[PDB]
């Protein structure tokens, strides 16, 4: 056995923690989040939302190695805003978008219980 | 233990230190019978 | 040796279409029309049946 | 024509090749006699009266495609490749896994490989119906894309779909047999199959002997791992000094079947076959039908491969840089011809010197099914969903799985067993010995100037020793 | 199997149709072992009586 | 600095595919839900086989593999089943499993097909998709087969036997109004199915201040879930991933002091 | 193990006389019997 | 006999004194990995859990080592021996209770090989000192050795079933000398020809050429995504080149962040028209040539093999001469990662649309071939009436052969030029030939226009039969098609008689390589 | 009675006849019987 089992790609171990914060010391108001056991499905959904905020200067993500399961996100905001603020405000805007789209979908499938035509 | 002939497939218990021949067929190639302890697989 | 149960690329279930495929080629159908009467429209799912060699029917000739 | 319409009826007419020679229409021509002859290569084109090359033709060829051997007549469009390429594949289709004989259940061969799901080509040469390549094929038609994706397929490598491997793609099995023969080498030294017990026998290791039965052999069905004993054979001492046979390391097989019988000189002997399944991983070697070998670089899931506008992800991705230097343009036509054969329902024809199948005749056939007339397609990126600015050339091709797998070539040594006379590192039954530190390696280190590393590798790593020497004289003490 | 003389290794004009021109191994045995073509037939012998 | 108001519009609806259109959203969101139809929708499938007597032509690990790829009806009772690694029971229990059973013996001289009509379960909610028949193996006079299997719950990142969908089409911008892709000769390319161009045009005129909208989907199904509950279970599954990550985050910047 | 360790600087060859051959040998008197073991 | 016991090779003087078999070594296949630094190597977990490294116990590392010795041979990062001061080598596999084992200053634990270690890595034949360099360990899941691509040029490797060995220094002195003498970033320039040995390679070169064209504009999201992959980025986003209609960055503007320090260089691109330095536009260059790197930023020019590969005066050579050996490493790694993550947006391929020409070019090729086959006939028929005059030092035959070669060689060139001047900017052959990644300008003409003229032993196809080449011709035929001139292209296919002559040429070209290896190896061994 | 343009089908009929009778290993089987 020199091949990892398939559940290592999404299942967290005992000592690990899913998210970790570190402050970048090269520029002010920068932060660097490190989500664990994750991939492009969640990494990309966040970055596109941060750019829609008019108070965010930088936003990006990378999977440092495709054979390990970990992503990294970097954010930088204006001096009157917090990276931890901009991050959590992004998530609550995705959830407010998905739950809305689910209602509009469940209506569309029962819009033709018998059929419109 | 129990052996299976190579031609007529008639099981016959061969005792330790005994010639290797079938019965009702007179044949000299024997296959050992499959075990009875169970092993489990994955569909993966 | 035996028809796979799933197309390798799509994932569509193929393993239940081998006897119906032989039955359509039996009467008069061309391979191009028999594959359309079964609902295989991507060229990755048609390769499955078009290029299959059935070796299981020749290993049933040896007495157990 | 009278000879043809009665030759297509050999089944119930008893008219065959022999009645064709005995009627004076064909003739065997030696090599010496072949210097006094004038050949035409094709009737309808070289035997027409005109301002002509010659006018005294004495013979004519049947088909100029019969100048190729057996392993070189399975290549589609071989008259489009560079010459050294056709030599490599003919020496490479001899080591591709497939099904090698129909009664592979009876034969207890050593080292037999068998593929799960073989398939016959979608682009065939007409001289493959006579060597039975559609009844015992070796390969699978895969959907190949020629693109640079993430850098893991550079310098002769391939990226392959991981969730196609999970549906049976290129899966195979691997058998292996072992012999043991009980023997009476002396009048007292005699061997016998029996289960060695710890207190009576003496020379055993501490390994487990519970899997063995009363006979001394393992019943089929158990899961024998590395370093297990399979055959218990004890020798009587002038008490009982046992031998045995152990596996190699890293097998993880399952005992298939056990046979017991009498060999030629009448000594009882047995044969044991071990079964093991091999799933493709990222060291294995894959090769096309045109001399493009290459290992596997990485495996992506289906949610990550690039897709087309209807959800067709490729199974294999190869580097575009492999084509322009070696000029295998026969590889670029069988994936264009193959895409027409899957959409129309026929099976293509790639006989070498056909002169009835251009590229303009294949391309015009493809634009009828609603595709671009050169194979290109618009692929979407799998990570971000964006379109790719270039259009990628994609289509089905026929790949083979070579015999060199990576489970068989990895080995390591770290303070292992050593010899007895010269005390140099030894491998023996260990399977993993050391790598030789040759003469040319002794010189790169001298040029480097590394004097410590050169000493360690030759003295401290291999047979260190100490002696005592006298001072006035120079002799050992 | 190691002689450097090329004339017993190169491809000769008279191999047309009787020995395969493309199939040969690399290494030290280049052109020393060869495979015969598809319709090539070797004679068996008879008596000149 | 806030979300959008996407609008859905269904075009077709059968028992094996759905065609719909999602307007007024971003490309990253329209793709992140294309990867969830494939990977992260849970489903039932066989994952534990034990063979008692196999005298057929295929070896034991061949049949144990052709069984896992058989699709089982996972319509309603996937939400009541725990993951076998979370459940507080032993290796197996009727709260996180479903037990199957096969036992076939060939006695007549004519060959016998061992279809999927032989998989006999105990729970009448999960059966193979039969309401033709997938072939498992053929037997000769004097051969037999009998085994026992359990069927767990998982999704498509474990193994490709747990994904519920065949090909999932997806595309946007049917005419290069954005020039995301660049044709060398735009005349040789067939016109898309969703295009609105004339019969004598190739591309729409370029507009620089554009943005991708109105994505087109087409989701087929293998037979386990209905094609409209593959979508509802995906959006309800992606929402529950972000909602759980927001917990871990606020738990971190709260324990910062 | 109680005596010091040191390098080598020069190797001198030469034939050795029967004198030291007899003086430093281990089986005094000499090996006489062509048979190695007896019981 | 005794003198027979110490024979030559495989005796006791030439087989076990200087060349022997060592321990602490492994061997397996190699596969690419673009995510590794040029000084790292990837090791599977089954090899790393087998080879060890003896670590002396000091009060600085007592706790970590006793923690490691708690878990032995079962967990991976463990240990498998304890060597105390007395020389007692106890085995952790058999000890009944591990907790009683208390490490003490002076003891010596036998650790498992972990990340960060140093190894020595060589390939099958070792020719120059670059065939054995010191890498650094990084442990990955599956079971092949993984290494970067720009290092495949020194080892002369390729990933089609190759194998390489590694040896693990056991002491600490040997570890220090391998570290300060033979690590791979210390061997970039070679003393053999005072030029670098590692340059940008097969796939990154083609993309670097396209990334630095005059018209490559990037949006905001893509620029951020690319900057995410720079390991030496200070944290500032440069001002775009176009600010108004909307902000767009350029390829050269992003590449200027990869270039280290403040270096200076002037090169040319491989398509620089030689008549450009003459007229005006010497410092304007309509074709965007004459690379100029001023104060560490790309001002103008396209990058290719003449400016990034392994030649004297390249960009990597200057960066090594000025900045040092520890910054060129980052240069290589950053180039590779950034360009790959842009290439998966731009894409690259090769098809048969890139191997075909328009209707006008085919007619021109047919015409020139017809006229050449005409001229050869006039030469032949004027040599049959004894109207040729030999030149000084030339037989009548050899003068004829020399002229027939000149007519035929010019057609291969003139047809070849026709195949090129009809190519397009979107062609994918021209894209690998121009950037210098793979191919040559004659393969284009051989694929599109004419294969050319075959020849064995450096001369035209000989008369293997008596006064013939094959039994399909008439005797003493000296025409072009009857003695090896293949006038088709690889796309139009060859006729049987041309297939055979092509096979002959290939066969001789295949034998020479088989001889060369043994010859050169033996002579080098003698000289050394 | 001449074969024109039906040559491609006809030549394969004659090649098939040779392989049906001689086979691929008649090389070995005929020198042994001798
Ligand atoms: Mg190689
Ligand atoms: Zn019997
Ligand atoms: Zn499919
Ligand atoms: Zn002395
Ligand atoms: Zn349970």
XYZ file of C-alpha atoms in Angstrom, chain D residues 26-470:
445
model
C -0.331 -17.220 -60.580
C 3.231 -18.388 -60.122
C 5.876 -18.561 -57.413
C 8.924 -16.414 -58.161
C 12.241 -16.927 -56.383
C 14.816 -14.205 -55.726
C 17.281 -15.255 -58.427
C 14.509 -15.570 -61.014
C 13.338 -12.119 -59.888
C 16.224 -10.489 -61.787
C 14.985 -11.664 -65.206
C 11.452 -10.340 -64.722
C 9.611 -7.059 -65.330
C 6.954 -6.272 -62.721
C 3.959 -3.955 -62.798
C 2.703 -2.706 -59.457
C -0.981 -2.338 -60.319
C -3.010 -3.499 -63.330
C -5.465 -0.684 -64.021
C -2.660 1.891 -64.027
C 0.544 0.397 -65.455
C -0.811 -1.801 -68.285
C -2.457 0.889 -70.410
C -1.139 1.638 -73.881
C 0.258 5.164 -74.096
C 3.594 6.860 -74.281
C 4.496 4.277 -71.681
C 7.407 3.379 -69.446
C 7.622 -0.230 -70.618
C 5.558 -2.487 -72.846
C 6.852 -6.001 -72.067
C 5.519 -6.553 -68.569
C 5.872 -10.167 -67.486
C 4.187 -10.228 -64.065
C 1.999 -8.102 -61.807
C 1.669 -7.742 -58.056
C -1.414 -8.719 -56.084
C -1.360 -5.899 -53.570
C 1.775 -3.929 -52.631
C 0.757 -4.063 -48.949
C 2.051 -7.631 -48.572
C 5.640 -6.411 -48.183
C 5.179 -5.901 -44.428
C 5.656 -8.361 -41.586
C 3.216 -9.378 -38.888
C 3.827 -6.745 -36.212
C 4.117 -3.949 -38.786
C 0.811 -4.596 -40.560
C -1.340 -3.434 -37.637
C -0.335 0.231 -38.031
C -2.949 2.490 -39.654
C -1.640 4.709 -42.431
C 2.000 3.587 -42.100
C 2.936 5.484 -45.261
C 2.488 8.830 -43.489
C 5.000 8.413 -40.638
C 8.729 8.962 -40.498
C 10.640 5.734 -40.997
C 12.288 5.111 -37.572
C 8.853 5.454 -35.980
C 7.509 2.350 -37.718
C 10.471 0.386 -36.385
C 9.764 1.324 -32.764
C 6.110 0.297 -32.734
C 6.795 -3.064 -34.377
C 9.170 -3.751 -31.466
C 6.628 -2.319 -29.010
C 3.356 -4.007 -29.921
C 5.110 -7.202 -28.848
C 4.849 -6.185 -25.186
C 1.286 -4.864 -24.959
C -1.076 -6.554 -22.517
C -4.166 -8.243 -23.901
C -5.662 -11.701 -23.877
C -3.031 -14.076 -25.219
C -4.949 -17.357 -25.582
C -8.514 -18.453 -24.991
C -7.766 -21.340 -22.607
C -5.797 -19.236 -20.151
C -7.720 -20.878 -17.301
C -5.962 -24.224 -17.639
C -2.413 -23.119 -18.385
C -0.327 -22.532 -15.269
C 2.164 -20.291 -17.051
C 4.471 -17.989 -15.158
C 3.990 -14.237 -15.581
C 0.700 -14.012 -17.479
C -1.042 -10.635 -17.919
C -4.703 -10.330 -18.946
C -6.803 -7.244 -19.670
C -10.380 -6.939 -18.430
C -12.146 -5.256 -21.367
C -10.296 -5.548 -24.690
C -11.724 -3.825 -27.745
C -11.089 -4.038 -31.456
C -9.915 -0.948 -33.350
C -12.200 1.570 -34.993
C -9.642 2.136 -37.771
C -8.427 -1.206 -39.104
C -6.116 -2.392 -41.840
C -7.562 -4.952 -44.240
C -4.727 -7.379 -43.459
C -5.861 -7.887 -39.866
C -8.715 -10.261 -40.654
C -6.119 -12.934 -41.455
C -4.105 -12.765 -38.222
C -7.097 -12.719 -35.852
C -6.718 -9.266 -34.355
C -10.470 -8.872 -33.964
C -10.830 -12.037 -31.869
C -7.893 -11.584 -29.477
C -7.329 -7.821 -29.395
C -5.030 -5.873 -27.083
C -6.072 -2.281 -26.410
C -8.975 0.105 -25.852
C -10.275 3.001 -27.943
C -9.745 6.099 -25.804
C -10.727 9.720 -26.432
C -7.478 11.673 -26.717
C -6.978 15.439 -26.663
C -3.747 17.100 -27.792
C -3.300 20.069 -25.483
C -1.128 21.589 -22.778
C -3.256 21.659 -19.641
C -1.298 22.022 -16.396
C 2.287 21.003 -17.160
C 2.042 17.426 -15.900
C 2.189 16.004 -19.431
C 5.441 17.590 -20.559
C 8.330 15.634 -22.071
C 6.485 12.446 -23.037
C 3.842 12.018 -20.355
C 0.039 11.745 -20.255
C -2.675 13.037 -17.945
C -5.535 10.581 -17.606
C -9.067 10.698 -16.260
C -9.346 9.319 -12.744
C -13.081 8.650 -12.746
C -12.735 6.611 -15.913
C -10.189 4.336 -14.263
C -12.891 3.724 -11.652
C -15.224 2.333 -14.333
C -12.831 -0.348 -15.614
C -10.513 1.621 -17.901
C -7.342 -0.367 -18.588
C -7.776 -2.534 -15.523
C -6.044 -5.891 -15.656
C -4.968 -8.926 -13.649
C -1.630 -10.656 -13.079
C -0.936 -14.356 -12.505
C 2.225 -16.119 -11.344
C 3.117 -19.745 -10.620
C 5.549 -21.418 -8.228
C 6.954 -24.951 -8.374
C 8.042 -27.215 -5.546
C 9.207 -30.803 -5.809
C 9.841 -33.177 -2.941
C 13.039 -35.115 -3.453
C 15.092 -37.935 -1.948
C 18.630 -36.664 -2.547
C 20.154 -39.269 -0.225
C 19.277 -42.532 1.455
C 18.480 -40.700 4.713
C 18.152 -37.069 3.599
C 14.514 -37.025 2.541
C 12.011 -34.202 2.098
C 8.262 -34.235 2.722
C 5.335 -31.799 2.677
C 4.134 -31.256 6.237
C 3.234 -28.481 8.650
C 6.415 -27.629 10.606
C 5.883 -27.452 14.366
C 8.014 -25.141 16.490
C 9.489 -27.535 19.078
C 10.316 -30.424 16.711
C 11.736 -28.616 13.681
C 14.525 -26.134 14.303
C 15.674 -24.043 11.328
C 12.437 -22.105 10.825
C 11.938 -18.364 11.123
C 9.376 -16.941 13.549
C 6.890 -16.316 10.723
C 3.355 -17.635 11.089
C 2.529 -21.186 9.995
C -1.233 -21.155 10.577
C -2.326 -20.691 6.964
C -0.770 -24.014 5.975
C -3.039 -27.046 6.158
C -2.111 -30.538 7.378
C -0.637 -31.364 3.969
C 1.706 -28.389 4.002
C -0.014 -26.397 1.246
C -2.335 -23.394 1.348
C -5.920 -23.933 0.281
C -7.057 -21.630 -2.546
C -9.046 -18.581 -1.542
C -6.944 -17.136 1.271
C -5.220 -13.761 0.983
C -1.464 -14.367 1.078
C 0.607 -11.257 1.693
C 4.312 -10.550 1.502
C 6.587 -12.716 3.640
C 4.093 -15.513 4.185
C 4.967 -19.185 3.952
C 2.990 -21.154 1.387
C 4.651 -24.581 1.230
C 5.927 -26.377 4.329
C 8.705 -28.842 3.528
C 10.726 -30.521 6.271
C 14.041 -32.359 5.883
C 15.051 -35.118 8.278
C 18.387 -34.549 10.025
C 21.027 -37.325 10.322
C 15.975 -34.773 14.031
C 13.817 -32.747 11.594
C 15.349 -29.630 10.044
C 12.659 -27.753 8.158
C 12.821 -25.779 4.945
C 9.969 -23.881 3.293
C 9.156 -21.445 0.506
C 8.243 -17.839 1.230
C 6.775 -15.213 -1.063
C 8.723 -12.354 -2.510
C 8.105 -8.988 -0.898
C 5.083 -6.832 -1.753
C 2.773 -9.256 -3.567
C -0.587 -8.995 -1.757
C -2.052 -11.720 -3.937
C -4.824 -14.245 -3.521
C -4.115 -17.949 -3.933
C -5.915 -18.975 -7.110
C -5.627 -22.762 -7.294
C -3.308 -25.545 -6.127
C -2.414 -28.623 -8.181
C -0.769 -31.858 -6.996
C 0.617 -34.557 -9.291
C 3.721 -36.529 -10.321
C 6.406 -35.102 -12.596
C 8.619 -37.043 -14.991
C 10.944 -38.979 -12.676
C 7.924 -39.762 -10.454
C 8.506 -37.410 -7.515
C 5.404 -35.787 -6.077
C 5.324 -32.085 -6.857
C 2.851 -29.224 -6.695
C 2.145 -25.954 -8.493
C 0.538 -22.845 -6.994
C -0.908 -19.840 -8.827
C -1.296 -16.412 -7.214
C -3.763 -13.820 -8.503
C -3.326 -10.065 -8.190
C -5.238 -7.127 -9.672
C -3.433 -4.106 -11.135
C -5.214 -0.743 -11.393
C -3.491 1.945 -13.508
C -1.547 4.477 -11.449
C 0.932 7.245 -12.060
C 3.987 5.247 -13.003
C 2.523 2.952 -15.637
C 3.593 3.038 -19.283
C 1.139 3.659 -22.129
C 1.843 3.672 -25.842
C 0.006 4.442 -29.056
C 0.176 2.593 -32.376
C 2.757 4.975 -33.859
C 5.721 4.804 -31.513
C 4.670 7.260 -28.804
C 5.428 5.718 -25.449
C 5.004 7.646 -22.228
C 4.321 7.244 -18.517
C 1.360 8.673 -16.594
C 1.890 12.005 -14.885
C -1.209 12.668 -12.779
C -4.877 11.672 -12.593
C -7.691 14.229 -12.422
C -11.319 13.521 -11.593
C -14.138 14.207 -14.054
C -15.029 17.465 -12.292
C -11.603 18.801 -13.322
C -10.942 17.719 -16.841
C -11.831 20.144 -19.661
C -15.187 19.456 -21.254
C -16.886 20.190 -24.571
C -20.187 21.973 -25.071
C -22.045 18.694 -24.444
C -20.050 17.103 -21.635
C -17.434 14.881 -23.277
C -14.258 14.876 -21.221
C -11.125 13.248 -22.646
C -9.673 10.114 -21.112
C -6.058 10.981 -21.982
C -4.279 14.291 -22.617
C -0.942 14.328 -24.442
C 1.564 17.071 -25.169
C 1.503 18.804 -28.558
C 5.308 18.926 -28.601
C 5.550 15.198 -29.298
C 4.406 15.622 -32.928
C 6.590 18.236 -34.658
C 9.975 16.659 -33.980
C 9.290 13.048 -34.991
C 6.592 13.691 -37.621
C 3.982 11.000 -36.950
C 1.169 12.372 -39.090
C -0.427 8.945 -39.264
C -1.345 9.579 -35.639
C -3.280 12.709 -36.569
C -5.406 11.067 -39.255
C -6.587 7.964 -37.411
C -8.105 10.212 -34.754
C -9.829 12.200 -37.496
C -10.896 9.043 -39.321
C -11.956 7.518 -36.019
C -14.344 10.362 -35.275
C -16.230 9.701 -38.510
C -16.463 5.976 -37.793
C -18.154 6.467 -34.420
C -20.711 8.927 -35.838
C -21.563 6.982 -38.983
C -21.463 3.483 -37.498
C -19.015 1.816 -39.887
C -15.427 0.788 -39.145
C -12.762 2.700 -41.013
C -10.151 1.490 -43.464
C -6.460 2.304 -43.176
C -4.808 -0.002 -45.711
C -1.483 1.671 -46.548
C -1.402 2.323 -50.299
C -5.084 2.927 -50.928
C -5.102 6.213 -52.890
C -8.873 6.361 -52.430
C -8.933 8.054 -48.995
C -7.550 11.593 -48.910
C -7.822 14.037 -46.077
C -10.166 16.144 -48.195
C -12.477 13.140 -48.465
C -12.500 12.458 -44.723
C -12.925 16.101 -43.732
C -15.867 16.607 -46.084
C -17.462 13.551 -44.478
C -17.075 15.026 -41.001
C -18.691 18.396 -41.692
C -21.913 16.526 -42.492
C -22.435 15.473 -38.858
C -22.157 19.038 -37.591
C -18.516 19.262 -36.538
C -15.596 21.399 -37.585
C -14.036 19.840 -40.649
C -10.573 19.359 -39.073
C -11.426 17.879 -35.679
C -10.953 21.032 -33.607
C -13.484 21.794 -30.882
C -14.132 24.494 -28.288
C -13.236 23.256 -24.808
C -14.137 24.853 -21.495
C -11.741 25.026 -18.581
C -12.646 22.645 -15.795
C -11.523 24.690 -12.807
C -13.070 28.068 -13.646
C -15.590 27.287 -16.394
C -14.094 29.875 -18.745
C -13.569 29.165 -22.423
C -10.095 28.340 -23.721
C -8.884 30.849 -26.296
C -7.501 28.175 -28.608
C -9.516 25.285 -30.028
C -8.313 21.832 -29.027
C -7.910 18.893 -31.409
C -9.841 15.961 -29.933
C -10.869 12.519 -31.152
C -10.824 8.772 -30.466
C -7.617 6.733 -30.819
C -6.437 3.215 -29.947
C -4.000 2.930 -27.034
C -2.239 -0.085 -25.547
C -0.960 -0.786 -22.045
C 2.645 -1.935 -22.014
C 4.041 -4.515 -19.624
C 6.408 -2.285 -17.608
C 4.499 -1.311 -14.464
C 5.952 0.639 -11.544
C 5.054 -1.867 -8.813
C 7.917 -3.996 -10.135
C 10.778 -1.506 -10.355
C 10.913 0.152 -6.907
C 13.455 -1.113 -4.381
C 15.542 0.247 -1.530
C 18.342 -0.870 0.775
C 19.359 0.468 4.189
C 21.724 -1.715 6.241
C 20.644 -5.039 4.806
C 22.124 -8.532 4.896
C 25.771 -8.938 3.922
C 27.836 -11.781 2.517
C 29.978 -14.131 4.576
C 33.373 -14.438 2.884
C 33.977 -10.852 1.722
C 31.375 -9.145 3.967
C 30.030 -7.135 1.030
C 26.329 -6.194 0.850
C 24.223 -9.063 -0.473
C 20.610 -9.332 -1.694
C 19.946 -13.107 -1.925
C 16.223 -13.812 -1.287
C 15.932 -10.274 0.245
C 14.884 -8.942 -3.240
C 16.362 -5.545 -2.321
C 20.145 -5.370 -2.495
C 22.376 -2.383 -3.210
C 23.100 -0.297 -6.295
C 26.579 -0.547 -7.770
C 28.888 2.459 -7.400
C 30.713 2.034 -10.680
C 33.902 3.496 -12.071
C 32.362 6.475 -13.861
C 30.626 7.527 -10.649
C 33.998 7.405 -8.889
C 35.214 10.159 -11.220
C 32.365 12.675 -11.038
C 33.049 12.782 -7.303
C 36.780 13.305 -7.837
C 36.094 16.226 -10.164
C 33.639 17.583 -7.589
C 36.411 17.589 -4.997
C 34.314 15.757 -2.417
C 36.804 13.604 -0.513
C 34.584 12.677 2.438
C 31.612 11.532 0.365
C 33.944 9.494 -1.831
C 35.307 7.723 1.247
C 31.907 7.027 2.817
C 30.450 5.467 -0.321
C 33.363 3.056 -0.780
C 34.570 2.184 2.722
C 32.115 3.128 5.468
C 29.052 2.071 3.477
C 30.646 -1.114 2.118
C 32.598 -3.568 4.300
C 34.242 -1.485 7.039
C 36.912 -3.283 9.027
C 39.732 -2.860 11.533
C 42.987 -4.765 11.942
C 46.041 -4.533 14.203
C 49.486 -3.882 12.739
C 52.930 -4.016 14.321
